[PDB]
Amino acid sequence: GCGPGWVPTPGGCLGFFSRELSWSRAESFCRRWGPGSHLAAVRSAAELRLLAELLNASRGGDGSGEGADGRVWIGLHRPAGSRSWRWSDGTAPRFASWHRTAKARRGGRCAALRDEEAFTSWAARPCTERNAFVCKAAA
């Protein structure tokens, strides 16, 4: 039972926010909803499809929520000093949909879903970049 403005996903609720914030500020914003809330982690292709539907908003409405107009921050990032990327919600890596090009895998330590392919892949962006974002409040 997700509140107004949020949609169901396995294990919790998704919430898209159009306000543009740096990765860190977006992650903090998500954490402010309470324990278990973070920038959304994507654990499977099925989960990504639900996210794509929410962000593209090509045919679906509830009350007062539209779709994303650009790249969207998600919970994957590479802390300074670490060689691998990790999800901000504590889940171990299991699924990844990096845009398959060398350029999309460099240029920053934070990942954002791309609007180019209707939110089906993500790329590395400067963590200071201000982008819209999506939170997942896990049960």
- In 22-98, DSSP assigns E strands to 37-39, 72-77, 86-87
CB 120 within 8 A of CB 112: no
Q: How far apart are CA 37 and CA 40, in angstroms?
A: 8
- Tell me the technique behind this structure: X-ray
Distances (CA, A) of 103 to 38, 69, 71, 81: 27, 22, 16, 21
Helix (H, G, I), strand (E, B) or coil at 50: helix
- The CB density around residue 87, as the number of other CB atoms within 10 Å, is 21
Domains and CATH numbers, the chain: 1-139 (3.10.100.10)
Widest Cα–Cα separation across the chain: 43
Resolution of this entry in Å? 1.5
Helix H or strand E encompassing 102:
none
CB 129 within 8 A of CB 22: yes
Q: How far apart are CA 79 and CA 94, in angstroms?
A: 18
CB 111 within 8 A of CB 93: no
The phi and psi torsions of 56 (rounded to 5 degrees) equal -75, -35
Helix (H, G, I), strand (E, B) or coil at 134: strand
- The CB density around residue 48, as the number of other CB atoms within 10 Å, is 21
